[PDB]
Amino acid sequence: IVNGEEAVPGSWPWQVSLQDKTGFHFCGGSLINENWVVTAAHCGVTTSDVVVAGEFDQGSSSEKIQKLKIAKVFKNSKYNSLTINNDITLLKLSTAASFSQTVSAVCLPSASDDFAAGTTCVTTGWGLTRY
Amino acid sequence: TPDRLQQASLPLLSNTNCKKYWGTKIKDAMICAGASGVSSCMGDSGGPLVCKKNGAWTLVGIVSWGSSTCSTSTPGVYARVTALVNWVQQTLAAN
């Protein structure tokens, strides 16, 4: 995020980091329950990648994080890689997340819910802060 | 990249207005947000765009794609969760 600010630690408890086997953060995701993470299809997750829950500072060795293995990757069958449309994948975890003060789920909308133009929302992540 | 988790608030746009920036690249399963002095950027992909509804944070978008330079005056593009939630529910129910 360019021109954002630091979050209060633990205040976005559904936010996860997707890391490859080298420890490199490559995408975010969101917990929707103890067993499932939503992310983007174009992130290209495989069962060799790791879901990290409960993290704030990727440079800290002292946080009580959960490193969760992925059982199966469910890429939405409507995903179109040419247009990047329907850009959603579900990850089924091999080991359930343990919910706590710093790890819990985001709500999903109904299909008919309306979010009007002009509404102020929030986005979070560990993406670049400058290009 | 930053070690510590970042946040930003930003407004939702309509798809019709987002098309002024991105043209026919904008499809019905996309929602745009930003152009407000902040931007999502590389490495944010897959993470949440949440809006508060009836006191609870609700997943409205998934960070998807936008400007190759993360311009803060151009909207970012997010996967539109309302268009996708029936598939989420079918997948969870079957697995």
Partner: peptide, 4 residues
């Protein structure tokens, strides 16, 4: 454009 670029994936994010």
């Amino acid at each position: 454009s670029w994936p994010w």
